[PDB]
């Protein structure tokens, strides 16, 4: 039996990224504890709420078990419930005097120079175990600061680390100890949030080493595809996985465990399932996958191209955007029976349908001004003017034009929904390459949602991704296995040049991704 287990000693810290000088990222990217005696940031209220809630929660119906445990360990039969909060000397000097001692906690100050003549002064870290051994308390929290964190980690006196990850960069003079991946492992991860203009997320480090019957009866009638889940050891060792990235990752997991084995065109073979939904809060984060690197320049130039209504593949290629290069080749168009189609003339695809649905497509150079239905203009007008309409849809799936398209759209339709100055978007995708396409598709429609929201004097809220035929290609399985056993970072944010007030005026400079913390790039094959 261990001191940190008997006496229930945990740390709790909030670390931010630190100023420096291709950047590399690890857990130790978040290590900024303070600057000039004070916190590195000016105020992040959501972490304070977390901290204040965590260090004051107790469950009295569980103390009799802890009290009993602590007594037997010390060879005793004896010792309103409160936690204990242990702080360093400077850390105690840090707090204003109106917030000292901390409300409803047993304040304990570690110091060699104090003792005014209740708040307890302990001269050595060993006096804590002695002081806890004669106290009535639920759990004991090490509030730091920098030195106190170091010694308590050294002496293995830490059971769990409650680690706020503040996803922004500050000037600091003090830093958290480099957590030792042997000593501790991340067991849980929280939702991502935005507070005071920064994203943050909350993780837990763990020290390493009747209706019950009724439920069983209902399961009476309840791996499959040569996947050994011990390859997902880290993925299956997390108790709580609240991070929104797990929506994507769990879908990868489910297809791999349960997918139906199917041939397809390329001859690779997929595992597929049918019908999924993901939701992302665009007002808290920008869902750019952090468990591998993703680039957005080509994604944005594809969307700007869409907005112009161009079908000319050469515009993308002269910008070195090659998303569509393979769909415009002589061979690809000839395989689509498009023998009278100029190379890279992709025909009536997304941009055309969004701005001229119904118009007779002739070639990518033709002048289509005012031919067809300006779907994009229509939905923007409806958002500004008839916001509760249920008819605000952007449809790319023109049944008459499919065969003339270099290929039919994967992204069938966007539906929009407006409430309380908030705009939500649904995109229905008929075919989803979970390994290669879906990460990009999530970012495209999120950016597009922000773009639509800003030109309609609204705030972005939810991006909803509906997957139809959803498939992992077999040659991706090994790469996704590596990716399932990485743990997400807090998401980045997207910034739009505020001065763009109409959907056609966005340019590549008007887009800025802030604080993108990611794992290493993974070539999916």
Ligand X SMILES: CCc1nc(N)nc(N)c1Cc1ccc(-c2cccc(C(=O)O)c2)cc1
- Per the annotation, where are the binding residues? 14, 33, 35, 37-38, 89-91, 111-113, 124, 145-148, 151, 265, 390-391, 410-411, 429-431, 433, 441, 471, 473
Of 494, 456, 483, 346, residue with least CA distance to 406: 346
**Secondary structure tally for the chain: helices H, strands E:** 15, 18
After which residues are there C–N gaps above 2.5 Å in the chain?
21, 79, 117, 209, 222
Q: Does 49 engage in binding with ligand NDP (CB under 6 A)?
A: no
CA angle 408, 409, 414 (to 5 degrees): 150
Residue 170's SS3 state is strand
Q: Does 57 engage in binding with a second copy (CB under 8 A)?
A: yes
- The entry of a second copy, ligand NDP, ligand X, none near residue 369 (CB within 5 to 8 angstroms by kind) is none
Contact assessment for residue 1 and residue 73, using Cβ atoms and an 8 Å cutoff:
yes
Least separation in angstroms between residue 114's CB and a second copy is 31
Q: For residue 445, is the peptide bond before it cis, meaning its omega torsion is within 30 degrees of 0?
A: no
Q: Does 410 engage in binding with ligand UMP (CB under 6 A)?
A: yes
Quick note: the x/- pattern for a second copy over 160-189, rule CB under 8 A, is --x-------------------------x-
- Report the alpha-carbon distance of residue 60 to residue 281 in Å, rounded: 36
Residues identified as active-site: 410
- String of b and e for 466-478 (b: at least 16 CB within 10 Å)? bbebbbbbeebbe
Q: At what angle do helices 437-455 and 245-258 cross, to 10 degrees?
A: 150
Q: For residue 101, is the peptide bond before it cis, meaning its omega torsion is within 30 degrees of 0?
A: yes
Q: Which secondary-structure segment (H or E) carries 203?
A: strand 198-207
Site residues for ligand X, 71-130, by CB under 6 A, read 95, 99, 102-103
By CB under 6 A, the count of residues binding ligand UMP is 11
Site residues for ligand NDP, 17-36, by CB under 6 A, read 33-34
> What are the binding residues for NADPH?
14, 33, 35, 37-38, 89-91, 111-113, 124, 145-148, 151
Residues 6 or more apart whose Cβ sits within 8 Å of residue 463: 279, 280, 282, 287, 424, 425, 427, 442, 445, 446, 449
- The entry of ligand NDP, a second copy, ligand X, none near residue 71 (CB within 5 to 8 angstroms by kind) is none
Q: Does 402 engage in binding with ligand X (CB under 6 A)?
A: no
DSSP codes of every residue in 64-110: HHHHHHHHHHTT-S-----EEEEEEHHHHHHS-GGG-SPTTEEEEEE
- The entry of ligand NDP, ligand X, a second copy, none near residue 103 (CB within 5 to 8 angstroms by kind) is ligand X
- Report the alpha-carbon distance of residue 401 to residue 403 in Å, rounded: 6
Quick one: 102 or 406, whose CB is closer to ligand X? 102
Both tokens of residue 433?
A: 């390459």
- The entry of ligand UMP, a second copy, ligand X, none near residue 263 (CB within 5 to 8 angstroms by kind) is a second copy
> What are the binding residues for NADP(+)?
14, 33, 37-38, 89-91, 111-113, 145-148, 151
- The entry of ligand UMP, ligand NDP, a second copy, none near residue 217 (CB within 5 to 8 angstroms by kind) is a second copy
478-to-231, 234, 474 alpha-carbon distances in Å:
10, 15, 8
Of 313, 339, 335, 340, residue with least CA distance to 325: 313
- Report the alpha-carbon distance of residue 501 to residue 454 in Å, rounded: 7
- Report the alpha-carbon distance of residue 180 to residue 185 in Å, rounded: 9
Q: Does 469 engage in binding with a second copy (CB under 8 A)?
A: yes
Site residues for ligand UMP, 167-206, by CB under 6 A, read none
Quick one: 163 or 440, whose CB is closer to ligand X? 163
Piece in contact with ligand UMP (CB under 6 A), picked from 5-13, 46-54, 327-335, 428-436: 428-436
Least separation in angstroms between residue 3's CB and ligand NDP is 15
Q: Does 111 engage in binding with ligand NDP (CB under 6 A)?
A: yes
Quick one: 10 or 448, whose CB is closer to ligand X? 10
Q: Does 164 engage in binding with ligand X (CB under 6 A)?
A: yes
By CB under 8 A, the count of residues binding a second copy is 75
Of 180, 167, 178, 245, residue with least CA distance to 487: 245
Q: Does 200 engage in binding with ligand X (CB under 6 A)?
A: no
> What are the binding residues for dUMP?
265, 390-391, 410-411, 429-431, 433, 441, 471, 473
- Torsion region of 267: left, alpha or beta (phi above 0 gives left; psi -120 to 50 gives alpha): left
- Report the alpha-carbon distance of residue 499 to residue 454 in Å, rounded: 10
Site residues for ligand NDP, 125-184, by CB under 6 A, read 125, 143-148, 151, 174
Among 3, 6, 9, 14, binds ligand X (CB under 6 A): 14
Q: Does 108 engage in binding with ligand NDP (CB under 6 A)?
A: no
Quick one: 289 or 410, whose CB is closer to ligand UMP? 410
Residue with tokens 């040659």: 475
- The entry of ligand X, ligand UMP, a second copy, none near residue 438 (CB within 5 to 8 angstroms by kind) is ligand UMP
Q: Does 441 engage in binding with ligand UMP (CB under 6 A)?
A: yes
Site residues for ligand NDP, 71-90, by CB under 6 A, read 88-90
- Could you say which DSSP state residue 248 is in? H
Q: What does the binding site for ligand NDP look like in residue numbers (CB under 6 A)?
A: 13-14, 33-34, 37-39, 88-91, 94, 110-114, 123-125, 143-148, 151, 174
Interacting residues toward ligand X by CB under 6 A: 12-14, 39, 47-48, 51-52, 95, 99, 102-103, 143-144, 164
**Site residues (vs ligand UMP, CB under 6 A):** 265, 390-391, 407, 410, 431-433, 437-438, 441
């Amino acid at each position: 039996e261990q001191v940190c287990d008997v006496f229930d000693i945990y740390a709790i810290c909030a670390c931010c990224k630190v100023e420096s000088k291709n950047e590399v990222f690890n857990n130790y990217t978040f290590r900024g504890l303070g600057n000039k005696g004070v916190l590195p940031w000016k105020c992040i209220s959501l972490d304070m709420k977390y901290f204040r809630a965590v260090t004051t929660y107790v469950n009295e119906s569980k103390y009799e078990k802890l009290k009993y445990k602590r007594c037997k360990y010390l060879n005793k039969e004896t010792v309103k419930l409160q936690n204990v909060v242990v702080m360093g000397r400077t850390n105690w000097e840090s707090i204003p005097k109106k917030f000292k001692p901390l409300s409803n906690r047993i304040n304990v100050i570690l110091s060699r120079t104090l003792k005014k003549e209740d708040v307890y002064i302990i001269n050595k870290v060993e006096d804590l175990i002695v002081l806890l051994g004669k106290l009535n308390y639920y759990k004991c929290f090490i509030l730091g600061g920098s030195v106190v964190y170091q010694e308590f980690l050294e002496k293995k006196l830490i059971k769990k680390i409650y680690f706020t990850r503040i996803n922004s960069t500050y000037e600091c003079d003090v830093f958290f100890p480099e957590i030792n991946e042997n000593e501790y492992q991340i067991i849980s991860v929280s939702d991502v949030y935005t507070s005071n203009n920064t994203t943050l997320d909350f993780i837990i480090y763990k020290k390493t080493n009747e209706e019950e019957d009724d439920f069983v009866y209902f399961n009476f009638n309840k791996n499959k595809n040569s996947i050994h889940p011990n390859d997902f050891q880290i993925y299956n060792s997390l108790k709580y996985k609240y991070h929104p990235e797990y929506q994507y990752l769990n879908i990868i997991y489910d297809i791999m465990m349960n997918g139906n084995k199917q041939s397809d065109r390329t001859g690779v073979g997929v595992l597929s399932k049918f019908g999924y939904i993901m939701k992302f809060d665009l007002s808290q984060y920008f869902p750019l996958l952090t468990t591998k690197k993703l680039f957005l320049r080509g994604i944005i130039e594809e969307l700007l191209w869409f907005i112009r209504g161009e079908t000319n593949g050469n515009t993308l290629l002269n910008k070195n955007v090659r998303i569509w290069e393979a769909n415009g080749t002589r061979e690809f168009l000839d395989n689509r029976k498009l023998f009278h189609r100029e190379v890279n003339d992709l025909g009536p695809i997304y941009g055309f349908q969004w701005r001229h649905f119904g118009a007779e497509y002739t070639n990518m150079y033709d002048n289509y001004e005012n031919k067809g239905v300006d779907q994009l203009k229509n939905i923007i007008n409806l958002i500004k003017n008839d916001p509760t309409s249920r008819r605000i849809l952007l449809c790319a799936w023109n049944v008459k034009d499919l065969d003339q398209m270099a290929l039919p759209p994967c992204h069938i339709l966007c539906q929009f929904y407006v409430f309380d100055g908030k705009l939500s978007c649904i995109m229905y995708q008929r075919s989803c390459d979970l390994g290669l396409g879906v990460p990009f598709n999530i970012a495209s429609y999120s950016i597009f949602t922000h773009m639509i929201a800003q030109v309609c004097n609204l705030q972005p809220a939810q991006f909803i991704h509906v997957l139809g035929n959803a498939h992992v290609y077999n040659n991706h399985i090994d790469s996704l296995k590596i990716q399932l056993n990485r743990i997400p970072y807090p998401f980045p944010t997207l910034k739009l040049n505020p001065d763009i007030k109409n959907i056609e005026d966005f340019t590549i400079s008007d887009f800025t991704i802030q604080n993108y913390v990611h794992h290493e790039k993974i070539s999916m094959d």
